[PDB]
Amino acid sequence: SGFRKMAFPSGKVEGCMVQVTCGTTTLNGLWLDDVVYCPRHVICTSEDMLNPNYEDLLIRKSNHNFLVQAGNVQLRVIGHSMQNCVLKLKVDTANPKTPKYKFVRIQPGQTFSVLACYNGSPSGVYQCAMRPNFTIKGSFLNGSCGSVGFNIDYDCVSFCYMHHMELPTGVHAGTDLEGNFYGPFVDRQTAQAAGTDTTITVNVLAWLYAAVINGDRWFLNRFTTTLNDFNLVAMKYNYEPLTQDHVDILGPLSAQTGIAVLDMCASLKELLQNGMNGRTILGSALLEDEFTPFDVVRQCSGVTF
Amino acid sequence: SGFRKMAFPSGKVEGCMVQVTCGTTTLNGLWLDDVVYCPRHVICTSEDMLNPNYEDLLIRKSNHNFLVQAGNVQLRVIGHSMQNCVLKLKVDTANPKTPKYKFVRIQPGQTFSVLACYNGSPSGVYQCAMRPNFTIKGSFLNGSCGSVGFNIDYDCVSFCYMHHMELPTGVHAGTDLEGNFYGPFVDRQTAQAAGTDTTITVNVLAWLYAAVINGDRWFLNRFTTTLNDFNLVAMKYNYEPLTQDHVDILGPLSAQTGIAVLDMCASLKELLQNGMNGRTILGSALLEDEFTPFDVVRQCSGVTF
Ligand SMILES: *C(=N)[C@H](C[C@@H]1CCNC1=O)NC(=O)[C@H](CC(C)C)NC(=O)c1ccc(-c2ccc(OC)cc2)cc1Cl
Numbered sequence: 222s223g224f225r226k227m228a229f230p231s232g233k234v235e236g237c238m239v240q241v242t243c244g245t246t247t248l249n250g251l252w253l254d255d256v257v258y259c260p261r262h263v264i265c266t267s268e269d270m271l272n273p274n275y276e277d278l279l280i281r282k283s284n285h286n287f288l289v290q291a292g293n294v295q296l297r298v299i300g301h302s303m304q305n306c307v308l309k310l311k312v313d314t315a316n317p318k319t320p321k322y323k324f325v326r327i328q329p330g331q332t333f334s335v336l337a338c339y340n341g342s343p344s345g346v347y348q349c350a351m352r353p354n355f356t357i358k359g360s361f362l363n364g365s366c367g368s369v370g371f372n373i374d375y376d377c378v379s380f381c382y383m384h385h386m387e388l389p390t391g392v393h394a395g396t397d398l399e400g401n402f403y404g405p406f407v408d409r410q411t412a413q414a415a416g417t418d419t420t421i422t423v424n425v426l427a428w429l430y431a432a433v434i435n436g437d438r439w440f441l442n443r444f445t446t447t448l449n450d451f452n453l454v455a456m457k458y459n460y461e462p463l464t465q466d467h468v469d470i471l472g473p474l475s476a477q478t479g480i481a482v483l484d485m486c487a488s489l490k491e492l493l494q495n496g497m498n499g500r501t502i503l504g505s506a507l508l509e510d511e512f513t514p515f516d517v518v519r520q521c522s523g524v525t526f
Numbered sequence: 527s528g529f530r531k532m533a534f535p536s537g538k539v540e541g542c543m544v545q546v547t548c549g550t551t552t553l554n555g556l557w558l559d560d561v562v563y564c565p566r567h568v569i570c571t572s573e574d575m576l577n578p579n580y581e582d583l584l585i586r587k588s589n590h591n592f593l594v595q596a597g598n599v600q601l602r603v604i605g606h607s608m609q610n611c612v613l614k615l616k617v618d619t620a621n622p623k624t625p626k627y628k629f630v631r632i633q634p635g636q637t638f639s640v641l642a643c644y645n646g647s648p649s650g651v652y653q654c655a656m657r658p659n660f661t662i663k664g665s666f667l668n669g670s671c672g673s674v675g676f677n678i679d680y681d682c683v684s685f686c687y688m689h690h691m692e693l694p695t696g697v698h699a700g701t702d703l704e705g706n707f708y709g710p711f712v713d714r715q716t717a718q719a720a721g722t723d724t725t726i727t728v729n730v731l732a733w734l735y736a737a738v739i740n741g742d743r744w745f746l747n748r749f750t751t752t753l754n755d756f757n758l759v760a761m762k763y764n765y766e767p768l769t770q771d772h773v774d775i776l777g778p779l780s781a782q783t784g785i786a787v788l789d790m791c792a793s794l795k796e797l798l799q800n801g802m803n804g805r806t807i808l809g810s811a812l813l814e815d816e817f818t819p820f821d822v823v824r825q826c827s828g829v830t831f
């Protein structure tokens with residue numbers, strides 16, 4: 222096809238992954254400057270995970286109870302603090318591989334790369350999207366907590382995600398790098414319901430736009446529509462209501478492809494009702510919503526770092 | 527679902543990507559020890575690409591005609607040589623970031639990660655598979671030549687691919703790190719037909735096996751079959767004939783899932799004939815063949831580096 226789900230080069234982020242062990246529990250940590258960030262439920266035993274009292278379990282723990290390993294070397298913890306749901310460990314050495322970074326909280330629909338880590342060593346990288354119900358559909362096993370989601374632009378690394386748990390529906394939930402969970406989720410072993418998920422509409426439109434340059438044009442039609450009428454049929458199929466803001470982001474894409482945004486909305490409208498009839502767009506037989514407009518522009522123009 | 531296409535951490539490979547400019551043409555290079563590897567058609571002008579005579583165009587070029595840039599620093603070329611279809615540039619400095627590496631030629635069906643590069647700076651990483659017709663379905667633009675495909679195990683980096691061109695059907699063709707093209711392809715601007723592609727059967731079986739642990743079990747049935755009868759229906763649907771060797775690789779997977787290999791073949795057989803009926807396995811509405819058995823084991827057990 223010529224279009225793939227591709228993640229940022231994980232070079233900068235690999236230099237910050239460390240191992241954090243507390244008692245018998247071990248997970249990944251993010252070593253930036255002289256601080257290491259990790260999920261706070263590292264101080265939890267298997268019995269404590271059913272209903273923890275984190276402020277009560279933390280005070281029992283001390284600096285020497287936290288062992289940080291950066292590969293085969295040891296870090297010495299000279300202070301600890303709880304910020305919401307992340308643990309902050311102050312070490313005596315500043316990470317020589319700390320990049321120009323930034324702690325951001327992303328919005329639903331936005332994408333980011335995930336460096337899946339186990340025991341502080343990188344395992345794999347993949348692209349992910351913040352679902353509108355504030356979950357992510359990742360690939361995580363036990364010991365994956367502490368892995369981070371990040372974006373990179375030019376030279377800066379924006380850490381936006383840290384992994385914490387898996388929901389009963391198999392999806393995943395985590396926090397930003399300040400400990401605040403994405404969504405109405407808490408860190409304890411209880412049945413937690415994610416809301417009714419939806420489809421990021423502006424993302425599907427950017428994907429259909431990407432398909433036009435890459436050869437697939439069979440879904441294109443000659444019908445057009447209006448912004449309202451599209452939203453009326455988008456509500457029924459569990460899609461986000463497109464706004465004038467959404468159209469403005471799809472703007473430069475429509476100027477390159479030469480097909481107006483409202484024309485593209487009509488093609489998706491008919492794709493929504495008429496189905497796919499067994500055909501494929503860009504190799505997929507479903508409608509992809511994990512490509513932002515900026516993602517489509519980045520891959521069809523080749524922005525590097 | 528709990529299963530994603532995830533590429534190796536690209537940290538080691540980013541340390542070897544350099545820029546190579548010859549005349550007005552520029553592409554990516556791979557800097558290992560004191561040698562830089564790059565596609566040989568860097569010595570080609572736009573007119574020369576229609577039918578080059580590489581040995582005749584090379585002798586006109588000299589050391590000072592090759593400028594290698596490792597970021598903002600310059601490398602000095604102290605010798606050049608043509609190995610098949612790759613150019614070898616000997617520099618005066620050994621790359622300090624050279625990892626433990628190895629030059630391998632992979633077989634059809636095998637997967638590898640691709641670090642897409644432009645002007646010697648990494649742009650993105652994604653998973654790819656060597657199609658049985660010796661093409662790959664990648665995501666490449668102009669200036670992407672010189673990007674490499676690689677696998678990583680424990681600590682070693684096995685470079686298996688270097689990008690060279692795009693075929694009329696939108697797929698891609700390249701060489702190993704010794705210049706030998708994968709398939710019957712040459713480096714010139716002419717209509718080149720890739721053969722009739724097929725579906726890596728042992729890969730689809732490993733994917734259905736991955737779906738079993740991850741929750742999807744609706745495609746499972748109670749019919750069983752034999753190795754022959756499966757192959758007879760695999761030929762008609764353009765699938766590789768499964769061999770006793772293929773079954774042996776799917777062995778440890780069948781022992782974990784507790785379902786024999788031949789039972790799994792019957793389920794794919796019915797999936798092949800009866801279709802999908804609109805259902806989805808692991809979120810996809812098609813049968814994925816870019817997951818090797820070893821890939822499925824690696825992600826369902828968490829092998830790190
Ligand atoms: C971190 N290392 C680890 C990664 C998890 C585990 C496997 N896959 C992942 O993403 N994180 C955890 O184990 C956390 C720890 C909490 C204290 C934050 N817990 C969970 O991930 C978790 C929480 C609740 C349930 C659950 C499911 C269904 C229920 O009823 C049907 C009840 C509770 C499961 C899990 Cl894995």
Ligand SMILES: *C(=N)[C@H](C[C@@H]1CCNC1=O)NC(=O)[C@H](CC(C)C)NC(=O)c1ccc(-c2ccc(OC)cc2)cc1Cl
Pocket residue numbers: 553567570575666667668669670671672690691692693694698712713714715716717718
């Ligand atoms: C490397 N930087 C560059 C990357 C290509 C270009 C865009 N996408 C890619 O993968 N490599 C090339 O441009 C090479 C150079 C050769 C001398 C190896 N060429 C091609 O990629 C190429 C070759 C032939 C055709 C072609 C297609 C159809 C035809 O008739 C229908 C005839 C020729 C196209 C291309 Cl892009």
